[PDB]
Design an enzyme around this catalytic site. Structure first.
Site, short mmCIF file in Angstrom:
data_model
loop_
_atom_site.label_atom_id
_atom_site.label_comp_id
_atom_site.label_asym_id
_atom_site.label_seq_id
_atom_site.Cartn_x
_atom_site.Cartn_y
_atom_site.Cartn_z
N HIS A 151 1.95 1.45 -5.72
CA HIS A 151 0.53 1.03 -5.85
C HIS A 151 -0.32 2.20 -6.34
CE1 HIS A 151 -3.30 -0.79 -5.07
NE2 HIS A 151 -3.59 0.11 -4.16
N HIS B 139 -5.77 7.50 -3.38
CA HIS B 139 -6.86 6.65 -2.83
C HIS B 139 -6.36 5.86 -1.62
CE1 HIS B 139 -5.00 3.25 -4.88
NE2 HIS B 139 -5.77 2.48 -4.10
N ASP B 140 -5.06 5.71 -1.43
CA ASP B 140 -4.51 4.97 -0.24
C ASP B 140 -3.53 5.86 0.57
OD1 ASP B 140 -5.71 2.40 -0.02
OD2 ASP B 140 -4.38 1.50 -1.59
N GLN C 276 -6.17 -17.81 -3.10
CA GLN C 276 -6.10 -17.03 -4.38
C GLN C 276 -7.28 -17.40 -5.27
OE1 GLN C 276 -3.79 -14.26 -5.48
NE2 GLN C 276 -4.38 -14.31 -3.34
N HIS D 80 0.84 -1.22 0.00
CA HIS D 80 0.00 0.00 0.00
C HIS D 80 0.87 1.27 0.00
CE1 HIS D 80 -3.35 -2.77 1.19
NE2 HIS D 80 -3.94 -2.06 0.23
C1 LIG Z 1 -8.41 -7.59 5.42
C2 LIG Z 1 -8.21 -8.13 4.01
O1 LIG Z 1 -9.35 -7.67 3.26
C3 LIG Z 1 -9.12 -7.82 1.83
C4 LIG Z 1 -9.47 -6.52 1.14
O2 LIG Z 1 -10.31 -5.77 1.61
N1 LIG Z 1 -8.83 -6.37 -0.06
N2 LIG Z 1 -8.10 -7.36 -0.57
C5 LIG Z 1 -7.41 -6.99 -1.64
C6 LIG Z 1 -6.64 -7.98 -2.31
C7 LIG Z 1 -6.10 -7.55 -3.52
C8 LIG Z 1 -5.38 -8.45 -4.23
O3 LIG Z 1 -4.74 -8.12 -5.46
C9 LIG Z 1 -4.78 -6.78 -6.05
C10 LIG Z 1 -5.21 -9.77 -3.78
BR1 LIG Z 1 -4.16 -11.09 -4.86
C11 LIG Z 1 -5.83 -10.22 -2.59
O4 LIG Z 1 -5.59 -11.59 -2.29
C12 LIG Z 1 -6.48 -12.20 -1.35
C13 LIG Z 1 -6.55 -9.34 -1.85
C14 LIG Z 1 -10.02 -8.96 1.40
C15 LIG Z 1 -9.36 -10.15 0.94
C16 LIG Z 1 -10.13 -11.25 0.59
C17 LIG Z 1 -11.56 -11.25 0.67
N3 LIG Z 1 -12.32 -12.43 0.27
C18 LIG Z 1 -11.77 -13.37 -0.74
C19 LIG Z 1 -12.56 -14.69 -0.79
O5 LIG Z 1 -13.95 -14.44 -0.87
C20 LIG Z 1 -14.57 -13.47 0.00
C21 LIG Z 1 -13.74 -12.18 0.07
C22 LIG Z 1 -12.20 -10.04 1.13
C23 LIG Z 1 -11.44 -8.91 1.54
MG LIG Z 2 -7.38 1.13 0.10
ZN LIG Z 3 -5.44 0.59 -3.08
#
Ligand SMILES: CCO[C@H](C(=O)NNCc1cc(OC)c(Br)c(OC)c1)c1ccc(N2CCOCC2)cc1
Ligand SMILES: [Mg+2]
Ligand SMILES: [Zn+2]
Length: 313
Positions: free
Chosen positions: A72, A106-107, A269, A68
């Site tokens: 990014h 945005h971050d 993933q 972040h």
């Molecule tokens: C506190 C973590 O919260 C994260 C979030 O808010 N953002 N995740 C961003 C993210 C970006 C990314 O690439 C740009 C990857 Br690769 C990634 O990998 C997991 C996660 C998040 C990660 C997985 C879920 N599942 C996932 C499964 O189903 C329900 C929601 C929901 C929320």
């Molecule tokens: Mg963010």
């Molecule tokens: Zn972001």
């Protein structure tokens, strides 16, 4: 006035493609952003002196965290540049202006921790902003930088254009809160399928811009496999630090955040591509057909994580 930024030939060509990686040379990133603003918006959109001062102050307010970070911010800005360039006539002048800035900001001042961890820690930002905690902070920081002497890139807008652009930026930044993306996408899905989707309806445009924000924010899953796989390391580096900090509060983290559960990552993933990424780019592609390359790249990366699970790498 007559001073264009120009990129070497390979970047001048590849910056136009959705899967462009901005490269390891940090000192080229301000120039790459200004280039994109000049082609997307015009040489006239911003006083270069003020834009340069804005860019450098935004860069200073991103921290040295594994994902972040400043890289990014610029990466997410490039994905918006490419959506905007492939959808020339769909977007007003104010929207092109607002959205590149919103993606860059945005971050702002991210510490590498989710809204969840701030709430469990009882961080002061969580008392001040009970939902979309970090995103309300990122918008707060964007407004503070805009008000520094010399940094008001919107100075030449009329009073009501100024109000409109800060409202575009506010909504665009709030929409990067992934907890909001799920209902946003479901609503866009119903609207598209029943044929009620109307881009002259402001509340509809707002939703479409929200989905564009999620698509840009997640755009590391739309890169060539070697870029996506190496970015996953930085993403998980933060997750596992937050996991460690949950264990220090005496909370077992979710497996995604537990560095003791690295073996579970490839299946994690698949969950993420199938529940978040693929549906995001699928709906985006139904609304904005020329963004199909983002969905095709996302599908290629899903197939690569399938190979990982099958021990074929
Ligand atoms: C506190 C973590 O919260 C994260 C979030 O808010 N953002 N995740 C961003 C993210 C970006 C990314 O690439 C740009 C990857 Br690769 C990634 O990998 C997991 C996660 C998040 C990660 C997985 C879920 N599942 C996932 C499964 O189903 C329900 C929601 C929901 C929320
Ligand atoms: Mg963010
Ligand atoms: Zn972001």
């Amino acid at each position: 006035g007559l001073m264009q930024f120009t990129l070497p030939v390979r970047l001048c060509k590849e910056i136009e493609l959705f899967h462009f990686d901005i490269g390891p040379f940090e000192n080229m990133w301000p120039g790459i952003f200004v280039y994109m603003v000049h082609r997307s918006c015009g040489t006239s959109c911003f006083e270069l002196e003020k834009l340069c001062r804005f860019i450098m102050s935004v860069k200073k307010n991103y921290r040295r965290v594994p994902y972040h970070n400043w890289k990014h911010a610029v990466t997410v800005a490039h994905c918006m540049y490419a959506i905007l360039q492939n959808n020339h006539t769909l977007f007003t002048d104010l929207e092109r202006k607002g959205l590149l800035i919103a993606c860059l900001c945005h971050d702002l001042d991210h510490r590498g921790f989710s809204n969840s961890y701030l709430q469990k820690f009882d961080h002061p930002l969580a008392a001040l902003y009970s939902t979309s905690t970090m995103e309300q902070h990122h918008f707060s920081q964007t407004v503070s930088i805009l008000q520094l002497e010399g940094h008001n890139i919107f100075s030449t807008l009329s009073s009501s254009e100024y109000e409109q652009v800060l409202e575009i930026i506010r909504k665009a930044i709030i929409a990067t809160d992934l907890a909001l993306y799920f209902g946003n996408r479901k609503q866009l899905e119903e609207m598209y399928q029943t044929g009620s989707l109307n881009l002259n309806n402001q509340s509809h445009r707002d939703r479409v811009i929200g989905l564009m924000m999620t698509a840009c924010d997640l755009c590391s899953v739309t890169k060539l496999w070697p870029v996506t796989k190496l970015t996953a390391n930085d993403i998980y580096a933060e997750f596992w630090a937050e996991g460690d900090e949950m264990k220090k509060l005496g909370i077992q983290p979710i497996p995604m955040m537990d560095r003791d559960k690295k073996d579970e990552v490839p299946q994690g993933q698949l969950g993420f591509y199938n529940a978040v990424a693929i549906p995001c780019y699928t709906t985006l592609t139904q609304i904005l057909p020329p963004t199909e390359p983002l969905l095709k790249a996302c599908r290629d990366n899903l197939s690569q994580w399938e190979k990982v699970i099958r021990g074929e790498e």
